[PDB]
């Protein structure tokens with residue numbers, strides 16, 4: 482299930498602790514720079530009506546999850562392609578070899594790429610195995626992006642705040658409206674507590690994860 486069940490248990494545990502009602506709250510003590518993620522989605526474009534969901538990762542790789550449930554990834558060299566078939570099977574190719582098979586999907590990818598480069602800003606830009614987008618969906622309040630490495634990223638439209646959950650290290654990275662970035666160990670938030678804002682979004686995340694699991 483790509484670590485979602487493990488993520489749900491982590492989120493329930495911290496939310497069950499009611500971290501915003503400790504009294505003596507010390508969020509900073511829950512920080513850990515060893516849990517900082519390597520990968521997250523830095524840009525995205527939703528054209529699901531026609532083609533699919535295009536996105537850029539923080540390494541500047543680009544990808545598309547097409548509506549036929551296939552996925553094409555362009556590495557940051559601008560030429561190397563990874564193609565993920567419906568059945569999970571993966572193959573590697575190049576743009577320069579001009580393959581008849583994927584010419585249309587490559588062309589589409591470049592259109593996504595060009596849009597993001599011209600019109601979108603890169604999230605997480607202020608800081609330092611390539612996963613692909615397994616699935617995504619959006620609510621009125623956010624878009625939920627589940628990567629093949631188990632990470633779940635949640636972008637809230639209203640305030641441009643973001644969550645990146647990593648179940649492997651039982652950690653959450655929180656990006657606030659000031660574009661400020663902090664990574665926390667979930668078990669420690671349980672102990673030292675946190676602000677109402679972070680707590681509310683972890684509750685929202687629990688629910689979004691259940692949705693992913695319900696599909």
Ligand SMILES: BrCc1cccc(I)c1
Nearest residue numbers: 526528532589592593596
């Ligand atoms: Br039909 C041009 C096109 C195709 C895919 C994505 C985008 I943004 C634009």
